[PDB]
Design an enzyme around this catalytic site. Structure first.
Site, PDB file in Angstrom:
ATOM      1  CE1 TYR A 332      -4.224   1.849   0.340  1.00 35.86           C
ATOM      2  CE2 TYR A 332      -2.719   3.320   1.282  1.00 35.86           C
ATOM      3  CZ  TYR A 332      -4.083   3.098   0.858  1.00 35.86           C
ATOM      4  OH  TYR A 332      -4.880   4.004   0.551  1.00 35.86           O
ATOM      5  CD  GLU A 366      -3.755   6.874   1.965  1.00 36.97           C
ATOM      6  OE1 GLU A 366      -4.242   6.374   0.965  1.00 36.97           O
ATOM      7  OE2 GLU A 366      -3.189   7.974   2.035  1.00 36.97           O
ATOM      8  CE  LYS A 427      -3.117   1.862  -8.891  1.00 34.99           C
ATOM      9  NZ  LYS A 427      -2.700   1.044  -7.886  1.00 34.99           N
TER      10      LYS A 427
HETATM   11  N1  LIG Z   1      -7.515  -8.033  -4.253  1.00 39.08           N
HETATM   12  C1  LIG Z   1      -6.336  -7.966  -3.109  1.00 39.08           C
HETATM   13  N2  LIG Z   1      -6.231  -9.038  -2.312  1.00 39.08           N
HETATM   14  C2  LIG Z   1      -5.279  -8.837  -0.969  1.00 39.08           C
HETATM   15  N3  LIG Z   1      -4.464  -7.760  -0.908  1.00 39.08           N
HETATM   16  C3  LIG Z   1      -4.806  -6.839  -1.966  1.00 39.08           C
HETATM   17  C4  LIG Z   1      -5.604  -6.875  -3.044  1.00 39.08           C
HETATM   18  N4  LIG Z   1      -5.500  -5.748  -3.739  1.00 39.08           N
HETATM   19  C5  LIG Z   1      -4.966  -4.907  -3.200  1.00 39.08           C
HETATM   20  N5  LIG Z   1      -4.287  -5.525  -1.988  1.00 39.08           N
HETATM   21  C6  LIG Z   1      -3.051  -5.108  -0.990  1.00 39.08           C
HETATM   22  O1  LIG Z   1      -3.425  -3.750  -0.589  1.00 39.08           O
HETATM   23  C7  LIG Z   1      -2.453  -2.733  -1.456  1.00 39.08           C
HETATM   24  C8  LIG Z   1      -3.426  -1.748  -2.437  1.00 39.08           C
HETATM   25  O2  LIG Z   1      -2.438  -0.931  -3.144  1.00 39.08           O
HETATM   26  P1  LIG Z   1      -3.122  -0.531  -4.725  1.00 39.08           P
HETATM   27  O3  LIG Z   1      -3.279  -1.905  -5.491  1.00 39.08           O
HETATM   28  O4  LIG Z   1      -1.969   0.299  -5.237  1.00 39.08           O
HETATM   29  O5  LIG Z   1      -4.599   0.319  -4.570  1.00 39.08           O
HETATM   30  C9  LIG Z   1      -1.457  -3.680  -2.456  1.00 39.08           C
HETATM   31  O6  LIG Z   1      -0.115  -3.001  -2.506  1.00 39.08           O
HETATM   32  C10 LIG Z   1      -1.773  -5.119  -1.490  1.00 39.08           C
HETATM   33  O7  LIG Z   1      -0.744  -5.226  -0.811  1.00 39.08           O
HETATM   34  N1  LIG Z   2      -3.817  10.905  -2.534  1.00 37.31           N
HETATM   35  C1  LIG Z   2      -4.000   9.584  -1.646  1.00 37.31           C
HETATM   36  N2  LIG Z   2      -3.478   9.534  -0.549  1.00 37.31           N
HETATM   37  N3  LIG Z   2      -4.209   8.402  -2.394  1.00 37.31           N
HETATM   38  C2  LIG Z   2      -4.284   6.913  -1.914  1.00 37.31           C
HETATM   39  C3  LIG Z   2      -4.677   6.211  -2.805  1.00 37.31           C
HETATM   40  C4  LIG Z   2      -4.014   4.796  -2.353  1.00 37.31           C
HETATM   41  C5  LIG Z   2      -3.212   4.386  -3.724  1.00 37.31           C
HETATM   42  C6  LIG Z   2      -2.015   3.545  -2.990  1.00 37.31           C
HETATM   43  O1  LIG Z   2      -1.746   2.270  -2.913  1.00 37.31           O
HETATM   44  O2  LIG Z   2      -1.029   4.650  -2.889  1.00 37.31           O
HETATM   45  N4  LIG Z   2      -3.897   3.208  -3.606  1.00 37.31           N
HETATM   46  C7  LIG Z   2      -5.109   2.578  -3.221  1.00 37.31           C
HETATM   47  C8  LIG Z   2      -5.265   2.073  -4.674  1.00 37.31           C
HETATM   48  C9  LIG Z   2      -4.048   2.758  -4.945  1.00 37.31           C
HETATM   49  O3  LIG Z   2      -3.791   3.293  -5.941  1.00 37.31           O
HETATM   50 MG   LIG Z   3      -3.356  -3.162  -7.460  1.00 38.72          MG
HETATM   51 MG   LIG Z   4      -0.343   0.100  -5.459  1.00 43.54          MG
END
Ligand SMILES: Nc1ncnc2c1ncn2[C@@H]1O[C@H](COP(=O)(O)O)[C@@H](O)[C@H]1O
Ligand SMILES: N=C(N)NCCC[C@@H](C(=O)O)N1CCC1=O
Ligand SMILES: [Mg+2]
Ligand SMILES: [Mg+2]
EC number: 6.3.3.4
Length: 491
Positions: A332, A366, A427
């Protein structure tokens, strides 16, 4: 495996948290002019290490929720040899040397309150990854890792008020509030701020530095002997973390969440097979996902519709986990410093959004630990590690968007550790891979909420949930999401 404490409620002069765990009230030696506190922690851990006392300067009591990652470093700047027994005593030792400036040196995931004499210090980590709130009044100071415990007086400058609350302020991210208990006066010092300048580095060095930093940040987050759990999505971020964690632990447990709309099981499987991890897939009905709404606002204590939408799937996943309490690492936050939403070659817009995001994250909660500790699980995020963050933020836009690929430097940094398919993987926002944003929109749309107006509806809904769960002391289970959507849709 788990920190000495997840949070706390303290006062200097019957706690109820979203966080799940044991409660332990610390002893009140100087009964009186002492620091009273209730710690919430795992049943399997001893609170001791989260509390430290001293007589240096005055009678002093420290309480710390969370943990510190750059321990070896902090220990190297201390005088004597007998090392402190825990992070709370470590902070204490540091305070005796640098005073409040001690926090400018810390790289961790923590929140702490300290009382020395009639002076009270409230500090957060560089990113405020562990929310901290306070109520200050001449002669009385109350601090808590959860505003909800403080909802049950004066205004504090350079601190923001909590929504729907009065006299309740959130300590800003990367800051230390110095409070004189006698006068009730408070002074806030920032101990970290996002870098504004950009660094230039050749590909090879840039990719190597990023790889090295992440490896170190992840290594600092994995407990020796214990195999960590990584929430894997198949995207480069969580996959990068998984590769690093696997190397530091020699083994790795993973887990992926999905709905009946959508999932990323396939993309994640590619990685679980490349590293041979112990994987588990969890599928929660869309209806069950939306029912999590009140739980997300309650745990995160956030009012941002967009963030709550990102947290829904994560919250559902943590609560749906089976087995013992785990140490969970996530990917995250990687997109923030890297502008993971930027979809073109023109660099200007990437930096604009990046700078804006970096200047407005505080208050969103978050990355709050409560998201997972509400189910007894501890989470930590290596991409927002101070060292990793500083570096990713500093890189010139051309290293983030390069070769027609977003977050280039990160992808290239994990190249020799993940399958090509995972490295070039476009992404996807967990909101898209499980249909959270669409589901929430459909819910409102099915209630009559017109289109150029769903966003505002989502705002009213989230804010309504907050007033009930955080401001009204109402447990999520006692709240029916549909009834709230109904009420809001009537407008
Ligand atoms: N479908 C999923 N199942 C489990 N963990 C997830 C999933 N989608 C996202 N995550 C976790 O939460 C974070 C969300 O970041 P993002 O994909 O950039 O929105 C990723 O870096 C994963 O560690
Ligand atoms: N302006 C902000 N603080 N945005 C946070 C979005 C989180 C982002 C991350 O993983 O950095 N994220 C969740 C899905 C995705 O992309
Ligand atoms: Mg993702
Ligand atoms: Mg990510």
């Amino acid at each position: 495996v788990l920190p000495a404490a997840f949070g706390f409620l303290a006062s200097a002069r019957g706690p109820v948290f979203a966080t799940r765990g044991s409660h332990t009230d610390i002893d009140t030696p100087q009964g009186e002019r002492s620091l009273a506190a209730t710690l919430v922690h795992a049943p399997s851990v001893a609170p001791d290490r989260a509390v430290a006392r001293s007589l240096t300067g005055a009678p002093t009591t420290a309480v710390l929720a969370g943990e510190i990652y750059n321990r070896d470093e902090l220990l190297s700047v201390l005088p004597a040899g007998p090392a402190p027994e825990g992070d709370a005593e470590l902070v204490l030792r540091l305070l005796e040397r640098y005073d409040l400036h001690a926090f400018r040196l810390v790289n961790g995931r923590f929140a702490t309150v300290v009382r020395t004499g009639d002076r009270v210090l409230l500090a957060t980590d560089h990113a405020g990854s562990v929310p901290l709130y306070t109520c200050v009044a001449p002669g009385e100071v109350r601090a808590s890792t959860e505003a909800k415990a403080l909802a049950a007086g004066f205004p504090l400058a350079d601190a923001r008020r909590v929504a729907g609350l009065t006299g309740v302020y959130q300590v800003p991210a990367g800051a230390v509030m110095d409070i004189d208990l006698g006068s009730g006066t408070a002074v806030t010092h920032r101990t970290w701020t996002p870098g504004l300048s950009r660094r230039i580095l050749p590909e090879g060095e840039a990719v190597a530095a990023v790889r090295a930093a992440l490896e170190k940040a992840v290594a600092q987050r994995v407990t020796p002997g214990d195999t960590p759990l990584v929430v894997l999505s198949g995207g480069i971020d969580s996959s990068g973390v998984a590769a690093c964690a696997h190397r530091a632990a020699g083994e790795l447990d993973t887990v992926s969440m999905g709905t009946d709309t959508s999932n990323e099981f396939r993309e994640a499987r590619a990685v679980v097979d490349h590293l041979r991890t112990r994987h588990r897939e969890i599928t929660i009905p869309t209806t069950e996902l939306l029912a999590q709404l009140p739980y997300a606002v309650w745990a995160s204590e956030s009012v941002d519709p967009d963030i709550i939408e990102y947290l829904l799937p994560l919250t559902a996943l943590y609560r749906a986990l089976d087995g013992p309490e785990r140490r969970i690492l996530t990917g995250y936050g990687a997109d923030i410093p890297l502008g993971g939403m930027h979809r073109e070659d023109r660099l200007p817009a990437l930096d604009t959004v990046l700078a804006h995001d970096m200047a407005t994250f505080d208050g969103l909660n978050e990355m709050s630990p409560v998201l997972s500790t509400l189910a007894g699980h501890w989470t930590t995020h290596p991409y927002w590690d101070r060292e990793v963050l500083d570096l990713l933020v500093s890189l010139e836009a051309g290293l983030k968007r390069r070769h027609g690929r977003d977050k280039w430097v990160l992808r290239a940094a994990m190249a020799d550790a993940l399958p090509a398919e995972t490295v070039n993987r476009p992404k996807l926002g967990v909101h898209e891979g499980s249909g959270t944003t669409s589901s929430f929109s459909r819910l409102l749309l099915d209630h009559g909420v017109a289109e150029d107006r769903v966003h505002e509806a989502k705002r009213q809904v989230v804010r309504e949930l907050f007033d009930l769960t955080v401001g009204g002391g109402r447990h999520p289970s006692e709240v029916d999401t549909d009834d709230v959507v109904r009420s809001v849709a009537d407008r």
